[PDB]
Amino acid sequence: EDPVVALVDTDATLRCSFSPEPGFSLAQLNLIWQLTDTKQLVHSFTEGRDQGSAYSNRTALFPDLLVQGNASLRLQRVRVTDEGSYTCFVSIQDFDSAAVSLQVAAPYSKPSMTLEPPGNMVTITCSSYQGYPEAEVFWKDGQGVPLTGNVTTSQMANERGLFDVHSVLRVVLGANGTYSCLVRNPVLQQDAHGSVTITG
Amino acid sequence: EDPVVALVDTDATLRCSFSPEPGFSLAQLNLIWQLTDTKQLVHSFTEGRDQGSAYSNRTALFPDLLVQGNASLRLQRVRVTDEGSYTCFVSIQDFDSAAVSLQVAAPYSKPSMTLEPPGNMVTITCSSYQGYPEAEVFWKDGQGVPLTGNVTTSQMANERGLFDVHSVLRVVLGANGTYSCLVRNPVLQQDAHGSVTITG
Numbered sequence: 001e002d003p004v005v006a007l008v009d010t011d012a013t014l015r016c017s018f019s020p021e022p023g024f025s026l027a028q029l030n031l032i033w034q035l036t037d038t039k040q041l042v043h044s045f046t047e048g049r050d051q052g053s054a055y056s057n058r059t060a061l062f063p064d065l066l067v068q069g070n071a072s073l074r075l076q077r078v079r080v081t082d083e084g085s086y087t088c089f090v091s092i093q094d095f096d097s098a099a100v101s102l103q104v105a106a107p108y109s110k111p112s113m114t115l116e117p118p119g120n121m122v123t124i125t126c127s128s129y130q131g132y133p134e135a136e137v138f139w140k141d142g143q144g145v146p147l148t149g150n151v152t153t154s155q156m157a158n159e160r161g162l163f164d165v166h167s168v169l170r171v172v173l174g175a176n177g178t179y180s181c182l183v184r185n186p187v188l189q190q191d192a193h194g195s196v197t198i199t200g
Numbered sequence: 201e202d203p204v205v206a207l208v209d210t211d212a213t214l215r216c217s218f219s220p221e222p223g224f225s226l227a228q229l230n231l232i233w234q235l236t237d238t239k240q241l242v243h244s245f246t247e248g249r250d251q252g253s254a255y256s257n258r259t260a261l262f263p264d265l266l267v268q269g270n271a272s273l274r275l276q277r278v279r280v281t282d283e284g285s286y287t288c289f290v291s292i293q294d295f296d297s298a299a300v301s302l303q304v305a306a307p308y309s310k311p312s313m314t315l316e317p318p319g320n321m322v323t324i325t326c327s328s329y330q331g332y333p334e335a336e337v338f339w340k341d342g343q344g345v346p347l348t349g350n351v352t353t354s355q356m357a358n359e360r361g362l363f364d365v366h367s368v369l370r371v372v373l374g375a376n377g378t379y380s381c382l383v384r385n386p387v388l389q390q391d392a393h394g395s396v397t398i399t400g
C-alpha cells in the first residue's frame with residue numbers, strides 16, 4: 001500500500017483484503033479497524049454482525065462486499081484530525097466438532113439365593129447388587145437349559161443410579177433339580193451366577 | 201470414535217484432536233467441551249487461558265498437550281449421571297493485519313499581496329488561506345529567480361486544523377522589479393502565486 005490522499009471534506013476508502021475459503025460465511029469473520037498507534041477502535045465486524053462506527057459515526061464497511069473478502073473501510077467528510085495510520089485486523093474462525101459418548105458401567109455382585117423350604121410350587125429368589133446398566137437375567141437348570149416358570153424380575157436404582165436386581169422364579173419341583181441364576185452385564189459382559197440344588 | 205466405557209468411580213478420557221499449523225500458539229485456540237444434547241458447558245479453553253471445569257470440578261485438559269493438538273478431556277470419578285454424548289468444539293483463529301496511512305490535504309487560496317507604498321526598504325506580504333499541510337513558500341523575481349531579502353513566514357492553523365500562511369519579504373528596491381510569491385502544497389502539488397510589479 002501507498003498512502004491515501006484525501007481532500008478535506010471528501011470521503012475516502014481505506015483498503016483491506018482477505019481471501020476467503022469456499023466454505024466461507026460471515027459468522028466466521030471477525031474484523032477490527034483500529035488507529036495503529038493508539039489502538040483505539042474505529043469500526044468492527046464481529047459475531048456475524050456489523051457493529052457500528054465506534055466514535056466517529058463517519059465510517060462504514062461495504063457489507064455486501066465482506067463475504068467476498070473486501071474489508072475496506074469508508075471514511076466520510078475527512079478532516080485533519082483523521083490523519084494517520086489505520087490498522088485492519090482480520091480473524092477468520094473455522095469451527096470443527098466431534099462427539100464422544102461415554103457409556104458408564106458397574107459390575108453386579110455375586111447373587112444371593114432364597115426360597116420357601118416335590119410337586120409343590122416354591123419360589124426362588126435371585127438378588128444381585130449395584131451394577132449398571134440394567135442386567136439381562138437368565139434362569140436355567142443345571143445343564144444350561146432355560147427353566148420354565150413364572151419369573152418376576154425387577155431392577156431398582158439407588159441414590160447414585162446403580163441397580164439392584166431382584167428376580168423371583170415360581171417353579172413346580174422335580175425331585176433332583178439344580179436351579180440357577182445368571183445375572184449378566186451386557187456392557188462389561190461380566191456374568192454373575194448363583195444356584196441352589198435340591199435333593200431334600 | 202467408538203463409545204467409551206468407564207467403570208463407575210474411575211477416571212476416563214474423552215478424545216478430541218486437531219492438527220495445528222507450524223505457526224500455532226495457544227492464544228489462537230478456542231476450545232469448548234459441551235454436553236451434546238443440552239449444550240451445557242463442561243470445560244473451556246479460551247483467550248490463551250484454560251478456564252475451569254464449568255460445573256463438575258471433575259474435568260481436566262492436558263494443558264501441556266494442547267499445543268500439539270490434543271484436546272481430549274479427563275473425566276474423574278465417573279458416575280451414572282455423566283453418561284451421555286459430549287461434543288468438542290475446536291476453533292483456531294489466524295489473525296492478520298494491514299496498515300494504511302491516510303494523508304489529508306487541502307488547497308491554498310490564491311495569495312493576496314500587500315506592501316508599504318527605489319533604494320528604500322519596503323515590505324511585501326503574501327497571504328494564502330486554508331491549506332493543508334504546511335506549504336513550501338518561494339519568493340522570486342519575474343524571471344523565476346529567488347529574491348534575496350529577509351523573509352519571515354508563519355503558518356497558523358484554525359479550529360479545523362487548516363493553515364493560513366502569511367509570508368513577509370523585506371526588500372530593497374530596484375526601479376523595475378516584479379515580486380512574486382509561490383505558495384506550494386507538497387502533497388497535492390498545487391501551486392498558488394501572486395505578484396506585484398513595481399515601476400512607480
Ligand SMILES: *[C@@H]1O[C@H](CO)[C@@H](O[C@@H]2O[C@H](CO)[C@@H](O[C@@H]3O[C@H](CO[C@H]4O[C@H](CO)[C@@H](O)[C@H](O)[C@@H]4O)[C@@H](O)[C@H](O)[C@@H]3O)[C@H](O)[C@H]2NC(C)=O)[C@H](O)[C@H]1NC(C)=O
Nearest residue numbers: 010011012013014015016017018062065069070071072074
Ligand atoms: C473494496 O471494495 C471497494 C468498494 O467498491 C472498492 O472500492 C472501489 O475501488 C474501485 C477500483 O479501484 C474504485 O474505482 C476507481 O475510483 C476512482 C474515483 O476517485 C476516488 O475519489 C473519490 C472522492 O471524490 C472517492 O469516492 C474514492 O476514494 C475514489 O476511489 C476513479 O478515478 C478510478 O478510475 C476508478 O473508477 C472505486 O471508486 C472504489 N469505490 C470506493 C467507494 O472507494 C475497492 O477497490 C475494493 N478493495 C479491495 C481490496 O478489493
Ligand SMILES: *[C@@H]1O[C@H](CO)[C@@H](O[C@@H]2O[C@H](CO)[C@@H](O[C@@H]3O[C@H](CO[C@H]4O[C@H](CO)[C@@H](O)[C@H](O)[C@@H]4O)[C@@H](O)[C@H](O)[C@@H]3O)[C@H](O)[C@H]2NC(C)=O)[C@H](O)[C@H]1NC(C)=O
Nearest residue numbers: 210211212213214215216217218262265269270271272274
Ligand atoms: C491425548 O493425550 C492423552 C493423554 O496422554 C492420550 O491419552 C493416553 O492415550 C494412551 C494411548 O492410547 C493411553 O495408553 C493406553 O492406556 C491403557 C490404560 O487403560 C485405561 O483405563 C484407565 C482407568 O483405570 C484410564 O486411566 C485411561 O482411560 C486408560 O486409557 C492401556 O491399556 C493401553 O495399553 C495404553 O497404555 C493412555 O492411558 C492415555 N492416558 C490417559 C490419561 O487417558 C490420548 O491418546 C491423546 N489423544 C489424542 C487424540 O492424541
Ligand SMILES: *[C@@H]1O[C@H](CO)[C@@H](O)[C@H](O)[C@H]1NC(C)=O
Nearest residue numbers: 052053054055056057058059
Ligand atoms: C453515533 O450514532 C448514533 C446513532 O446510531 C447516535 O445515537 C450517537 O449519538 C452518535 N455519536 C456521535 C459521537 O456522533
Ligand SMILES: *[C@@H]1O[C@H](CO)[C@@H](O)[C@H](O)[C@H]1NC(C)=O
Nearest residue numbers: 252253254255256257258259
Ligand atoms: C469448583 O472449584 C472451585 C475451586 O476452584 C470451588 O470454589 C467451587 O466451589 C467448586 N464448585 C463445585 C460445584 O464443586
